[PDB]
Ligand binder design. Sequence first.
Ligand SMILES: *[C@@H]1O[C@H](CO)[C@@H](O)[C@H](O)[C@H]1NC(C)=O
Lengths: 48, 48
Amino acid sequence: NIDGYFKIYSKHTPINLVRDLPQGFSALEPLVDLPIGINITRFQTLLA
Amino acid sequence: NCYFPLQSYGFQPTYGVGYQPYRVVVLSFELLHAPATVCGPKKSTNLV
Ligand SMILES: *[C@@H]1O[C@H](CO)[C@@H](O)[C@H](O)[C@H]1NC(C)=O
């Protein structure tokens, strides 16, 4: 959240691994930018 | 000296140049305290 704009950058990549955060390297692309202005102090996810 | 505070309008096609019904829009805006989520159209020209 930068000067009233929220921003999302993301990636999806294929793997084969059992346990931990895969060691290696890739960048995230910017997906969406929104002019929301709010104070994000904190957050939560959403399960289904 | 009690009064019900409203008075319904009267609009007949016979009325003079004053009594008649006129529609209004006010493009009110409150300006320049936050990130922009509107501006006018940004006209453009052919690529030489
Ligand atoms: C964000 O926090 C600042 C500091 O209190 C305040 O000036 C601003 O109005 C707040 N905006 C919102 C949408 O909470």
